[PDB]
Amino acid sequence: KAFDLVVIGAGSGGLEAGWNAATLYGKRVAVVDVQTSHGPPFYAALGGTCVNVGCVPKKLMVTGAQYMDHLRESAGFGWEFDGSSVKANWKKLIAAKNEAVLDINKSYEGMFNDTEGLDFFLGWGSLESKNVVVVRETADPKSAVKERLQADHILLATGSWPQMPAIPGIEHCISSNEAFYLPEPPRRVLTVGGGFISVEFAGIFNAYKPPGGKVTLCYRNNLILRGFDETIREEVTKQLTANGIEIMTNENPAKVSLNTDGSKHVTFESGKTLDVDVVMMAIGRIPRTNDLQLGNVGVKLTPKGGVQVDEFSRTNVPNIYAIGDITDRLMLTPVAINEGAALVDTVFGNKPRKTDHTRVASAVFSIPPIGTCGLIEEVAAKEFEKVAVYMSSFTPLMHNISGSKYKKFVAKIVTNHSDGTVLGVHLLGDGAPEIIQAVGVCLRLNAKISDFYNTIGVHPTSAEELCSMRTPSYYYVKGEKME
């Protein structure tokens, strides 16, 4: 069968691309994915990683985990109830999450059924030749052929996959993929990794753990959440700790064996030991290029295994493009979507457009959460002669009453002190992901600190901190910090 466009991977970026090419540019579009609904065996499915085993379900589960804080915090505001009657029913959370995800699966299924010139094929897509995608029964390239798709243009949009360290007893560990389907909440869990997935799951497990349970997070480096503002890294560490999570920094699993009762016995490189019910590996995500048989067409890969692309998402092979996590640029759903739209505009619209991967608002749904956009000060300080940092940090008043006095709000604006241009905004605290969105629009408009402090605050909010900072807290001059 012959298509203007064949998309391999029905995820965030692949669906934006396929829908746009079919509906905006009237192209005949094929999209391939390995599953029509979420979960084992392949986890991602129609809708992509975000829908099935990422942003959507994780946000629902963090929302669930937040009620542990709300129930406790209610008491400061006079709420009374039987504390000993309180149970976090993980089974109900997972069932609620499963229905929400399946509903999305079903709506995408209906989208394909109802959208003419947009066709879904089930199975494993690989490149036979530069204008032929082959859809097979399994990831094994010797499995039965279901379809052979003639394609003027081919989009690679297969996303990423959890990285598992080749350590002894790796087989006794899970990734985030399995964590979404645990039938029971682990009493003891080790999250391995200092990144958003490890931190976010540490919070989920911490809220739903059965009585006398314990969540441990381990990270090889000295301070979790590299890439984030350093004050926020230190505070999120303190605030996880204050809510009963054990943060093991400078620690990495050397191996895992089973205790006789089937629990996991962890030996760290330091020779510390930890017995847990679950070991969740969240140490990285790698582009999914193995199954694509890219050797058949000579698409250029990085040693990492990403598809190398120009700024327009073009491979070295004419008519073959890649967007989203498979490109290893920024692994966020809205970025994959933006890359997919820009690619289709460029190729089928002759409306040349590239995704700006700078000044991208993002969030960590830690408890409490992070919202960030643009450069951290250390990075700005290497690129700009004079950098100013405006900082406001304090326990919000509601958290003096709630009894969570450890919940320090942090708001930091990083500027080019030579002209006041805002380079980065970094927030930690309730509402941070919601606050930062319109800050993304500010950084696109080259907002200066004067644009923030001359804007009238909304009161009372956490956000108004951003519009109340007149005077730098400190500077970097030629890369050096000056009070």
Ligand X SMILES: Cc1cc2nc3c(=O)[nH]c(=O)nc-3n(C[C@H](O)[C@H](O)[C@H](O)COP(=O)(O)OP(=O)(O)OC[C@H]3O[C@@H](n4cnc5c(N)ncnc54)[C@H](O)[C@@H]3O)c2cc1C
Ligand Y SMILES: CC(=O)N1CCN(CCCc2ccccc2)CC1
Binding site, annotated residues: 59, 125, 158-160, 193-200, 284, 325
Residues in 423-462 that interact with ligand Y by CB under 6 A = 457, 459
Q: Is the distance from CB of 157 to CB of 315 less than 8 angstroms?
A: no
CA gap 248, 250 in Å, rounded: 7
Can you say how many angstroms the Cα of residue 369 is from the centroid of all Cα atoms in its chain?
13
C-alpha separations of 81 from 43, 74, 77, 228 in Å = 39, 10, 12, 39
Interface with Mg ion includes 30 (CB under 5 A)?
no
Contact between 397 and ligand Y per CB under 6 A: yes
Given a second copy, ligand X, Br ion, none, residue 222, with its beta carbon under 5 to 8 Å by kind, binds Br ion
Give the nearest distance from C-beta 432 to ligand Y in angstroms: 15
Return the residue of 145, 258, 445, 477 that touches a second copy, per CB under 8 A: 445
Partner from a second copy, Mg ion, ligand X, none contacting 115, C-beta within 5 to 8 A by type: Mg ion
Residues binding a second copy: number (CB under 8 A) = 79
Does 118 help bind Mg ion (rule: CB under 5 A)?
yes
345 binds ligand X (CB under 6 A): no
Q: Pick out residues in 303-362 that bind a second copy (CB under 8 A).
A: 332-335, 337-338, 355-356, 360-362
Q: Is 38 a catalytic residue?
A: no
Which option in ligand X, Br ion, a second copy, none does residue 221 bind, with CB closer than 5 to 8 A by kind? Br ion
The residue assigned the tokens 């960590």 is: 364
Give the closest residue to 146 by CA, choosing from 133, 129, 156.
133
Instruction: Read off the amino acid at residue 119.
Output: D
Q: What are phi and psi of 36, to 5 degrees?
A: -95, -15
Binding residues for FAD: 59, 125, 158-160, 325
**Which of 59, 468, 472, 473 touches ligand Y by CB under 6 A?**
468
What is the closest distance, in whole angstroms, from the C-beta atom of residue 416 to ligand X in the complex?
27
Binding mask 330-369 for ligand Y (x = CB under 6 A): ---x---x--------------------------------
Cα-based distances in Å from 178 to 11, 162, 172, 475: 19, 11, 12, 45
Active-site residue among 70, 172, 357, 459? 459
User: How open is the CA angle 366-370-372, to the nearest 5 degrees?
Assistant: 150
Q: Closest CB to ligand X among 36 and 267? A: 36
Q: Does 13 bind ligand X (CB under 6 A)?
A: yes
Which distant-in-sequence residues (6+ apart) come within 8 Å of 44 by Cβ?
A: 11, 33, 34, 35, 52, 53, 159
Residue for token pair 């629990």: 263
**CB–CB of 240/246 below 8 Å?**
no
> If binding is defined by CB under 6 A, does position 185 make contact with ligand X?
no
- The answer to the question of residue 420 lying near a second copy (CB under 8 A) is no
Tokens of residue 75, six digits? 């008491």
Contacts of 108-117 spanning 24+ positions with Cβ under 8 A? 108/10, 108/15, 108/46, 108/47, 108/51, 109/36, 109/46, 111/19, 112/31, 115/19, 115/22, 115/23, 116/22, 117/22, 117/26, 117/27, 117/28, 117/29
Site string for ligand X, 128-167 (x = CB under 6 A): -----------------------------xxx--------
Q: Does 125 bind ligand X (CB under 6 A)?
A: yes
**Residues making contact with ligand X (CB under 6 A):** 8-14, 32-35, 42, 44-45, 48-50, 54-55, 58, 124-125, 157-159, 176, 197, 288, 291-292, 324-326, 331-334, 336, 459
Q: Which residues are catalytic?
A: 459
